[PDB]
From a paper:
Here, we study fold transition between distinct β-barrels by protein engineering and structural biology technique. Here, we discover that the previously reconstructed ancient DPBB sequence could also adopt a β-barrel fold named Double-Zeta β-barrel ([name]), as a metamorphic protein. The [name] fold is not found in any modern protein, although its structure shares similarities with RIFT and OB. Furthermore, the reconstructed OB fold could also be converted to the four-stranded SH3 fold by a simple circular permutation. Thus, these ancient β-barrel folds (DPBB, RIFT, OB, and SH3) could be readily interconverted by a few feasible mutations through the missing-link fold, [name], indicating their significantly close evolutionary relationships.
Design-1 exhibited the metamorphic property, adapting two different folds, DPBB and [name]. Different ligand molecules probably induced the metamorphism in design-1. In the crystal structure of the DPBB-fold, two malonate ions bind to a positively charged pocket around the α1 helix, and are coordinated by Lys24, Arg27, and Lys33. Alternatively, in the crystal structure of design-1 with the [name] fold, two additional residues, Arg21, and Arg18’ from the other chain, coordinate the two sulfates. The sulfate ions may attract these two additional residues in the folding process, and then stabilize the inverted β2-strand in the [name]-fold. We also found that high concentrations of sulfate ion (≥1500 mM) increased ANS fluorescence. Its spectral pattern was slightly different compared to malonates, perhaps due to the difference in the DPBB- and [name]-folds. The changes in the CD spectrum patterns depending on the sulfate ions were also observed. These experiments demonstrated that the small ions mediate the folding of design-1, and their types may lead to two different structures.
Author numbering:
A (entry chain A), B (entry chain A): 1 to 43
The structure:
Amino acid sequence: KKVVARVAEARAEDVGKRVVRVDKAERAKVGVKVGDVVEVKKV
Amino acid sequence: KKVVARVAEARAEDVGKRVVRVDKAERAKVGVKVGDVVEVKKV
């Protein structure tokens, strides 16, 4: 269905874990900043 | 609008960068594995 998540800053602890990278240009495209709620959906 | 991205494994280089964490249970909920295309949308 969909995942409700938050944009975060990757920490040392996150290495090796699954993530979706969102760079600054992608963040400007969708209008998000660290801490914002986003929806992650399979294509 | 929306961001088209891929589930990845966070590397050492990703520390300090913005990401959306998707743990195994979230991955089972949406049906994704590392390498899969997902859409990231602002709420």
